[PDB]
Amino acid sequence: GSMPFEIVFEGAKEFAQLIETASRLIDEAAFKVTEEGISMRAMDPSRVVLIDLNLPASIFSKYEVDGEETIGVNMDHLKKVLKRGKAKETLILRKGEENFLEISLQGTATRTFKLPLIELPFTAKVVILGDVIKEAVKDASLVSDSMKFIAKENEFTMRAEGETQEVEVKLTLEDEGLLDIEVQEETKSAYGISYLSDMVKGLGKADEVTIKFGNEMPMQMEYYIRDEGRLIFLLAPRV
């Protein structure tokens, strides 16, 4: 036997969206469940992007954890079960003595499923609205498979060049999209678009996205979960 737990989230469809949003690039993940909260850590199969989803105890209406354990489930089966959650439904994540996860969706009825279980020296920081960065990624995807990110003093540039076409998205603090731009020195880096597209899919104006990067080094993309939780991506630069 492993440690039992009962964890309740209000808004089953919103929770499915976090798990969907955090696991578009991955096939497997580890869930560290402690008294403080849940941590989901994963890497995509090409080991280019590290995912870290932190869900503290405070975002749950009920959080009964009297120990510590690391748990793995089939992520395809999990996403399919969570996709069954409706907008204002209650989500219950229960575990007993056995190696099984019990997932309840409370609404017009209670539907219970059972699943078997198993510091970078950054040069630039940018706080951007989620709709602007999702637009920019999509625009770059039309011309290339790589996207360049440039941070100058009070200016953030996104560019992509292909065999025939080019794209450029420039931003200053004057633009509605740029909330903050802290730059030590001129910073330029290029990243894969397949990875960026899955990180930015489903972002909007309500999303304050922090992007940290350096010269020829990884990008840290971060956005908050109800001002307590956090979804972080650490993305390797392109060769």
The dihedral sign for the CA sequence 206, 212, 215, 218: negative
Does the footprint of its own copies cover residue 81 (CB under 8 A)?
yes
What is the smallest separation between the CB atom of 36 and its own copies, expressed in angstroms? 30
What is the smallest separation between the CB atom of 196 and its own copies, expressed in angstroms? 16
A 10 A CB-CB count for 168 gives 14
Span of 39-47, 128-136, 193-201, 225-233 interacting with its own copies by CB under 8 A: 128-136
Query: If we measure between CA atoms, which residue out of 80, 85, 145 comes closest to residue 115?
Result: 80
Candidates 125, 138, 152, 230: give the one binding its own copies (CB under 8 A).
138
7 Cβ neighbours under 8 A, 6+ residues apart: 33, 38, 60, 62, 63, 64, 65, 92, 93, 94
Does the footprint of its own copies cover residue 112 (CB under 8 A)?
yes
Does the footprint of its own copies cover residue 196 (CB under 8 A)?
no
What is the smallest separation between the CB atom of 222 and its own copies, expressed in angstroms? 20
Of 35 and 166, the one with the shorter C-beta distance to its own copies is 166
Of 109 and 239, the one with the shorter C-beta distance to its own copies is 109
> Residue type for 186, please?
E
Does the footprint of its own copies cover residue 114 (CB under 8 A)?
yes
Q: Are 38 and 29 in contact, with CB atoms under 8 Å apart?
A: no
C-alpha to C-alpha distance for 22 and 28, rounded to whole angstroms: 11
Does the footprint of its own copies cover residue 129 (CB under 8 A)?
yes
Q: Are 201 and 192 in contact, with CB atoms under 8 Å apart?
A: no
Of 79 and 125, the one with the shorter C-beta distance to its own copies is 79
- In the block, which residue shows the tokens 């979804």? 231
- Applying CB under 8 A, the residues found at the interface with its own copies are 74, 77, 80-81, 84, 108-116, 129, 131-132, 135-136, 138-139, 142-143, 164-171, 175-177, 205
